[PDB]
Amino acid sequence: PPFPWFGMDIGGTLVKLVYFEPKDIKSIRKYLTSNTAYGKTGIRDVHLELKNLTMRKGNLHFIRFPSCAMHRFIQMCATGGGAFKFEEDFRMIADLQLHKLDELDCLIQGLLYVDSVGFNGKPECYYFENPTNPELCQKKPYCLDNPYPMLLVNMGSGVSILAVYSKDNYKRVTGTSLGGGTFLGLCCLLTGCETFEEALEMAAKGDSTNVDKLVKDIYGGDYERFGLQGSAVASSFGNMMSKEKRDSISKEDLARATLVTITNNIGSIARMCALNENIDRVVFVGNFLRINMVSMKLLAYAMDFWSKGQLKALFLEHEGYFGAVGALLELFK
Template sequence: FSANAIRVTRKVHHKCQGVDPTTYEYCKGRNYIYIHTHTHKMPHRPRVRCLVRQGRKERRRKARNVAAGGWIPEFLEIVEETQDTKEDDDFGEKDSGYDDWDLTMPWFGMDIGGTLTKLVYFEPKDITPDELDQEAEILRNIRRYLTKHSAYGKTGHRDAHLQMDNVEIRGRRGSLHFIRFPTSEMGNFLTLARAKGMAQLVTTVCATGGGAFKFEKDFKDQVNMKLAKFDELDALIKGILFTDLHNHNECYYWENASDITRSEKKRYDFSMPYPFILVNVGSGVSVLTVRGPDDYRRISGTSLGGGTFLGLCCLLTGCQTFEEAIQLATEGDHKKVDKLVRDIYGGDYERFGLPGDLVAASFGQMNSRERRASVSREDLANATLVTITNNIGSIARMCASNEKIDRVVFVGNFLRVNPISMKLLAFAMDYWSRGTLKALFLEHEGYFGAVGCLLQFNGEIMSGSFHNDNHESSSATGSEVE
């Protein structure tokens, strides 16, 4: 909404056909809202203009919140802003077009992936008493529901341990909450959104990922929401840079990755990140080279990603969820399933530096009936995980070598609750590069796309604004911090 003109978003009620909506004024001695409805015939949708007479930004917010929160009569309907609203306000301030969303609607960013949907919600914490008094009851209830629960139904979860506090977005300070649910449950999500009254407040939701296109019609038809779609790779990069800036413990690596029982996480200073290879592991895999906040390109990828792992595990073990598949993999031994170098050579292949316990053929033992009869579900899950991880690591190492970049950052929800794969990737990068490549990981894993599109939708993105001189680093390539 602009500071000069909005269109009101309330449903037309046929019972109001006899009302003559000419001019409505709300001043009470302050004269800060003037609303005029254009000529129309009920129950058709009227157009509404809201002029804010006082220059203080807080009063403008309050005025618009009164309008959106229920003061305007029920028979008015809010539709999208038109060109005649895109003018300077009466006090010489330019309007971004989205400045006033902070009180009239929740702030959401969605990344609708092939397997998992990620939702980021910004909760303002600097709401003034006046703003709180004027806040719509629906908005207040939505905020309470999202922030007071860690589970929503059977499949929705809020990752409370990832919550980021004291984050500034669009001049407001608050907390970022991170919520996920299976994309297959999108229908239930829309039903919940409708039940909580979100359709009465939120007219547009920012979204990225393939599902932003796939479910666009469902959002419009079921909850009257428009999806503002953003490129997922653009959103991914912006989200990573913003999150790392606001969380100094975001980036880490695995020390002693070759020994799973002894390896541990160590913080890594990522304040001077460029250049780096970015490997995004979701249902599939994309590999990007990143040389600056606006200088990046996709250089490779593979269809064998997290979706492949989960699909094969479901087929081979009968598991139902990603968490169950990972738990099975944690308890299994892939060496009972894979054919190793020593199974072929009787030991190490010294001429080419191949250790005996290196996988020579994934699932290579399963052509034997006796072997198939002896393996467990856990062994099959572990072998599947190792197969997918080894493939990703091989592609990442090749890309880093071709681009002559020595740091590889792995992100994506495949790494959620999955330290096995992280340690395998860390070991592979270090071993096969003879210590010249470093595998890095980020705490918020698969949420960066949702963060990035929320920032872009609210106009927060500015080239080069994320990593500033206040971050100190011991070298141009980053430094390890114990």
């Protein structure tokens, strides 16, 4: 294949671009390498850069920028919903030759490829120890050298759970309609916020125990008969039919309760799927995790809760760029 090897994930909002810079052999090459920011909008996440990679030896770069500056980009292999929309501009202005690729297959291929090459000597996978304890919480590396088989929980507006047995064998096991879209949708209705970033920032600061009814609220403490700790949620939003309780809540509390309800639910479903499929590595991905680490930490707590500590929620360092990586890999085909 011929040089400038790119891969693109054009979403209706954010655009992800990955570029493999050949080491030790063209004005475009200098522009990318000599700049950390592009067009006063684009950003190049240097910390995600993969060095000494062999595809020839080179480095893999990760760049991102709003789908708005896509017109500027044109003036200066792809997947994503925004691929179609701009297919026109890609031809009218510059040269099209745009090969549309499936979002899911690109995600899987990219995810598996990055995990296989590692993160510059370190694992691509990680988890959280003591997720809900601000003072003890810690992101920890987890070597996932053989990801087969694994369960992939892809959280977008809704949630799809896939069982991955090989590069080309992944099937949807199940899913849930209570996902990121449910979180934002409810947050908009309950707090008047408008964006994901706003809702997540709110959730990170709130206290859901003001809106949710806890087990200890019913039994004064743990309910040993059911092996339920007093801190467990008995009923999500279960205190909200009481005017007195509503008088003590804040919008942040509502956002938090919404997020907690969704993450705890996903954890329960993912854990039962792991049990039924006999798989013990559950990896979580999706835009539902890209703005605030609060979501991952809550998913970490949920997986540990429902599994009784047997299963950890696993995450990937390059989440968000897998579709783009998958697109790039198609060039070699």
